[PDB]
Curated annotation (Swiss-Prot), chain A:
Species: Homo sapiens (Human)
Localisation: Cell membrane
Residues making up the signal peptide according to the UniProt record: none
Post-translational modification: Phosphorylated. Phosphorylation by kinases such as PKA and/or PKG. In smooth muscles, phosphorylation affects its activity.
Lineage, top ranks: Eukaryota, Metazoa, Chordata, Craniata, Vertebrata
Name this protein carries in UniProt: Calcium-activated potassium channel subunit alpha-1
Domain RCK N-terminal: 1-119
């Protein structure tokens, strides 16, 4: 998150009126508390999955410019987090089929599963 | 008894065939019949479920069991979907359409 | 004796033994029905019970087949079964799928041919419970690999079963089912 | 199943390869104790994983009459083939005492076997 927040909420942007809403089931440690306290006016964290559509109803996913799904740089199996992010794309497009999603993958042969979805 | 016979060695062994054996494979299987090539192609459209029940049971002893109706059948405009839903125990009021795949329990000839 | 009835209510089936020719010959209304007015050639074909198709116990190298080998034989009408099973993954008991699909209430030509698709090094760990049934096949591939499904004649095929062998590993809850949903969509595309 | 060997003593073992040692040798020594005549002896048939008994057989390989049956004590056909009905006391010993789930569940295999033999 830090690099993404450093190169997203940067001083030299034009007209940033956009409030980042993180949504993740694991509660953060103290370092992320210190990081979210630094960006108080732009960042809101929430706890919960992106598979329960009630949790998507809490973050107002129905109306948002876009939803970005991040991915870990490392893992035991890349087909774990690849297919998990494909699952998250399936869920978010199942809720509201007119949203832009900018995701991440870890392989190239797992990215063909995103053309699988008709939405 | 077959739970016991599988319980003896954790395997499904077998042997020869008797007139007791081939008399045991007369159970009633589960199947799904069309409404085009069948006998009741006349009863295919506008036939009530009850008449199909009786004319199937009194002729073939096939227990009519449910109607597997196509989803975009009650709609007026022709769609292209082939997903069909399941209706269990239809009463006399239930109008039949010719493009169904009626669930029935079939006997063994 | 007992009868097993499909109804809509328990009072509909309380009716079901209140019957007499005299008391209830000519009543067509169910509410009217409910009156307690009664005054009162030695080839091994089947198994020992004779209820399942039983062939001879064969070797697993017979019913193994490559991608191009199944691509040669057109085998329409069949039933494929996908398995996401690793070697360390827990058992499923695929035998209980083959028994009621080889149930001897069907004729021998009437049967549906089963082709499993998955890791051969999983199916060898369960094949000692399935090695008695007449026609069956193994495809040593991956259900996500689309070329095996092209070679398995999925388009000209009966319902294809997707079963997740590795239910054992559980990440979150829904993520446990990720492989099955991912496969089904891939088959649809 | 060919050789009828009545009077014998079977010993069941629930031993996996990774499971800890038992020391079955200390069962065979006082049952081969030279206070008995050679015809007077009780023949021991172990029943269990051969890939466990190979890990302890280097301590038992000196004794006159002994046998291994590579099966499972829960598998009833091996007990039919081991002539359990025409046999002396049958010993059930749980090799995998190492894995311990709860407390009683550790002893589940032994109780399950004994009941199966009784049926």
């Amino acid at each position: 998150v830090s690099n993404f927040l450093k190169d997203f909420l940067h001083k030299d942007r034009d007209d940033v009126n956009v409030e980042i809403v993180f949504l993740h089931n694991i509660s953060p440690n103290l370092e992320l508390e210190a990081l979210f306290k630094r960006h108080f006016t732009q960042v809101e964290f929430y706890q919960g999955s992106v598979l329960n559509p009630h949790d998507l109803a809490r973050v107002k996913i129905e109306s948002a410019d876009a939803c970005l799904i991040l991915a870990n740089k490392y893992c035991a199996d890349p087909d774990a987090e690849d297919a998990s992010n494909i699952m998250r794309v399936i869920s978010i497009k199942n809720y509201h089929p007119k949203i832009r999603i900018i995701t991440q993958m870890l392989q190239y042969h797992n990215k063909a599963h995103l053309l699988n979805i008709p939405s | 008894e077959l739970e016991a016979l599988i319980a003896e060695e954790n395997a499904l062994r077998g042997g020869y065939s008797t007139p007791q054996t081939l008399a045991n494979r007369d159970r009633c299987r589960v199947a799904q019949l069309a409404l085009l090539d069948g006998p009741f192609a006349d009863l295919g459209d506008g036939g009530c479920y009850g008449d199909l029940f009786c004319k199937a049971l009194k002729t073939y002893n096939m227990l009519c069991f449910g109607i597997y109706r196509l989803r975009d059948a009650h709609l007026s405009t022709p769609s292209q979907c082939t997903k069909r839903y399941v209706i269990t125990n239809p009463p006399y009021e239930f109008e039949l359409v010719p493009t169904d795949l009626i669930f029935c329990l079939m006997q063994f000839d | 004796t007992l009868g097993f009835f499909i109804a809509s209510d328990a009072k509909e089936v309380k009716r079901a033994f209140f019957y007499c020719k005299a008391c209830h010959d000519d009543i067509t209304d169910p509410k009217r029905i409910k009156k307690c007015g009664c005054k009162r050639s030695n080839v091994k074909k089947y198994d020992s019970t004779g209820m399942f198709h039983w062939c001879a116990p064969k070797e697993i190298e017979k019913v193994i087949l490559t991608r191009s080998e199944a691509a040669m034989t057109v085998l329409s009408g069949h039933v494929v079964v996908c398995i996401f099973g690793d070697v360390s993954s827990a058992l499923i008991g695929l035998r209980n799928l083959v028994m009621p699909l080889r149930a001897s209430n069907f004729h021998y030509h009437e049967l549906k041919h089963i082709v499993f698709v998955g890791s051969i090094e999983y199916l060898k760990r369960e094949w000692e419970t399935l090695h008695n049934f007449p026609k069956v096949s193994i495809l040593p591939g991956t259900p996500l690999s689309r070329a095996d499904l092209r070679a398995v004649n999925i388009n000209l095929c009966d319902m294809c079963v997707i079963l997740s062998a590795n239910q054992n590993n559980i990440d979150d809850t829904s993520l446990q089912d990720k492989e099955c949903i991912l496969a089904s969509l891939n088959i649809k595309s």
